[PDB]
Write a protein that binds this ligand. Structure first.
Ligand SMILES: [Zn+2]
Ligand SMILES: [Zn+2]
Length: 70
C-alpha cells in the first residue's frame, strides 16, 4: 500500500535497525541506542533514551536548563 517503503530506519540517522538493541521507539519516532539528539542543539546521547517527546526530542541539556526534576 502507499509508495514502496524501504525498511525500518532510524530518525536522526536512518540506520536500518530491527533488534530491540538497535531499534528504539519513543513518542512514535524510531531512535537507536545512541542517536537520541537534542531537537535544538542536536546533541546526541547514548542510553537510547533521554528527554524525548512527541514530534520533538531533547537531551538533558536544553531540558536541564528548563529545570524539570522528574
Ligand atoms: Zn539511528
Ligand atoms: Zn540539547
Amino acid at each position: 500500500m502507499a509508495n514502496a517503503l524501504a525498511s525500518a530506519t532510524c530518525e536522526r540517522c536512518k540506520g536500518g535497525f530491527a533488534p530491540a538493541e538497535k531499534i528504539v521507539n519513543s513518542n512514535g519516532e524510531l531512535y537507536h541506542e545512541q542517536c537520541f539528539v537534542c531537537a535544538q542543539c542536536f546533541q546526541q546521547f547514548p542510553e537510547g533514551l533521554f528527554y524525548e517527546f512527541e514530534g520533538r526530542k531533547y537531551c538533558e541539556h536544553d531540558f536541564q536548563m528548563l529545570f524539570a526534576p522528574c
